[PDB]
């Protein structure tokens, strides 16, 4: 059914499937590494529930087996969280909007500083390219379908991926971009996904080390972590 | 497995 | 001077800059022996990679600092995509060297190497499925060199756009329609995300093999490794 | 760095 939708219909379905922007348990009436880590992991855990139900609404995802759905989410969950965070932070230069009540400088854990600058640089890149919401939801769906696709069934996924590629080009054509500009912008967007993968890998390593340190992760967040 | 179950419900 | 070339001139320059295929220093493999072979091969390939990088259009225009950053960031990705490309005509096998062709079973000689082997094999079969051309390969490899560390910039992005134009040009000549062209461009660039993933997995394994002192690593290979902390 | 030397030569 995902193959039948038009480009505009693809966009609409993706926009309508968008998860909510959740709030943190952050209280500004108190200034630490352990507590900050707690806020972020707690937020990520509650977001994971919405992401799972968002994935079901991504065209073509329900056509996959339960095992394959589990695999794709296990592989791309941190990538999806990160591109969402980066998208939220576009209007806030030098800042990361984890939640509407949680907006952080790079000033505000160990090793987290590196990931922060990478997330900031990613947000700055999107701001420079003036990334559109219609393009964002396309990229996020691509991450879900592509990140674990190489780790019949793969033929359907690539077909949906091609459809999302069709959609991105259609959006850029409407924006007035020439054919050359469309290919270039398409490339620029997909190359960023390589950096998002990199940030996720680095984030996954730090998440495991924080786990072994036992400084506060949920059961779901741990199961997602053990899968990597 | 939580992810397994949440994908069902 | 890179932005001035035609797409055909870009292809010719990249093909001409191609590093040689090196041989292993060639008995059934142990853990330490295979690791010795692979890291020794990697070390010798790094010297050729550096000189290959200089011959990538627009790379010399960058400062020495930026050249170092890009290479430190992407060197394993570049080794891997080269390996994957060499193994295309050898399904189920990895051609590290013409005298060093390994399969999945031999990957069990080293713990944790089995997972990386599969990902590399999967990437090779993917290129084989898409019928990746050599002209497309040299474009993708140069993209990795310029992109991987660019977000850790205007000229690089301009050269990246130039290579994008070069890719589409190659596809337009192959007889692909406009729709086919965008789609294949997307398919190729999405694989770069998996190559990044394999590199990070490979980098972590190399760091652990370093810690365990299984086999002494070269000073160069260690400095490329330390750059990723 | 060795990378410095190899890049300059
Ligand atoms: C485990 N960590 C320490 C870090 C490294 C990067 C961190 C994530 C970046 C993206 C992100 C996005 C969210 O929407 C919520 C939370 C998070 C973070 C949660 C905590 C992580 C996973
Ligand atoms: C650390 N390792 C053991 C592994 C993990 C991935 C391995 C590399 C894969 C790609 C590759 C490519 C080459 O052309 C030469 C050597 C190598 C390998 C060298 C040894 C590495 C780094």
From Swiss-Prot, chain A:
Phosphorylated by cyclin A/CDK2 and CK1. Phosphorylation probably enhances transcriptional activity. Self-association induces phosphorylation. Phosphorylated by LMTK3 in vitro. Residues 6-228 are annotated as: Transactivation AF-2. Selective estrogen receptor modulators (SERMs), such as tamoxifen, raloxifene, toremifene, lasofoxifene, clomifene, femarelle and ormeloxifene, have tissue selective agonistic and antagonistic effects on the estrogen receptor (ER). They interfere with the ER association with coactivators or corepressors, mainly involving the AF-2 domain. Changing residue 138 to A: Loss of hormone binding capacity and temperature-sensitive loss in DNA-binding. Binds DNA as a homodimer. Can form a heterodimer with ESR2. Interacts with FOXC2, MAP1S, SLC30A9, UBE1C and NCOA3 coactivator. Interacts with PELP1, the interaction is enhanced by 17-beta-estradiol, the interaction increases ESR1 transcriptional activity. Interacts with EP300; the interaction is estrogen-dependent and enhanced by CITED1. Interacts with CITED1; the interaction is estrogen-dependent. Interacts with NCOA5 and NCOA6 coactivators. Interacts with NCOA7; the interaction is a ligand-inducible. Interacts with PHB2, and UBE1C. Interacts with AKAP13. Interacts with CUEDC2. Residues 6-228 form the NR LBD domain. A lipid is attached at residue 138 (S-palmitoyl cysteine). Belongs to the nuclear hormone receptor family. NR3 subfamily. 17beta-estradiol binds at residues 47, 88, 206. The modification Phosphotyrosine is found at residue 218. It is found in: Nucleus; Golgi apparatus; Cell membrane. Residues 1-228 are annotated as: Self-association. Widely expressed. Not expressed in the pituitary gland. Residues 1-228 are annotated as: Interaction with AKAP13. This is Estrogen receptor. Changing residue 69 to H: In ESTRR; results in highly reduced activity. It comes from the Eukaryota. The gene is ESR1. Changing residue 94 to V: Destabilizes the receptor and decreases its affinity for estradiol at 25 degrees Celsius, but not at 4 degrees Celsius. It is linked to Estrogen resistance: A disorder characterized by partial or complete resistance to estrogens, in the presence of elevated estrogen serum levels. Clinical features include absence of the pubertal growth spurt, delayed bone maturation, unfused epiphyses, reduced bone mineral density, osteoporosis, continued growth into adulthood and very tall adult stature. Glucose intolerance, hyperinsulinemia and lipid abnormalities may also be present. Nuclear hormone receptor. The steroid hormones and their receptors are involved in the regulation of eukaryotic gene expression and affect cellular proliferation and differentiation in target tissues. Ligand-dependent nuclear transactivation involves either direct homodimer binding to a palindromic estrogen response element (ERE) sequence or association with other DNA-binding transcription factors, such as AP-1/c-Jun, c-Fos, ATF-2, Sp1 and Sp3, to mediate ERE-independent signaling.
From Swiss-Prot, chain C:
Residues 1-229 are annotated as: Interaction with AKAP13. Residues 1-229 are annotated as: Self-association. This is Estrogen receptor. It comes from Homo sapiens (Human). Residues 6-228 form the NR LBD domain. The gene is ESR1. Changing residue 139 to A: Loss of hormone binding capacity and temperature-sensitive loss in DNA-binding. Nuclear hormone receptor. The steroid hormones and their receptors are involved in the regulation of eukaryotic gene expression and affect cellular proliferation and differentiation in target tissues. Ligand-dependent nuclear transactivation involves either direct homodimer binding to a palindromic estrogen response element (ERE) sequence or association with other DNA-binding transcription factors, such as AP-1/c-Jun, c-Fos, ATF-2, Sp1 and Sp3, to mediate ERE-independent signaling. 17beta-estradiol binds at residues 45, 86, 205. Composed of three domains: a modulating N-terminal domain, a DNA-binding domain and a C-terminal ligand-binding domain. The modulating domain, also known as A/B or AF-1 domain has a ligand-independent transactivation function. The C-terminus contains a ligand-dependent transactivation domain, also known as E/F or AF-2 domain which overlaps with the ligand binding domain. AF-1 and AF-2 activate transcription independently and synergistically and act in a promoter- and cell-specific manner. AF-1 seems to provide the major transactivation function in differentiated cells. Residues 6-229 are annotated as: Transactivation AF-2.
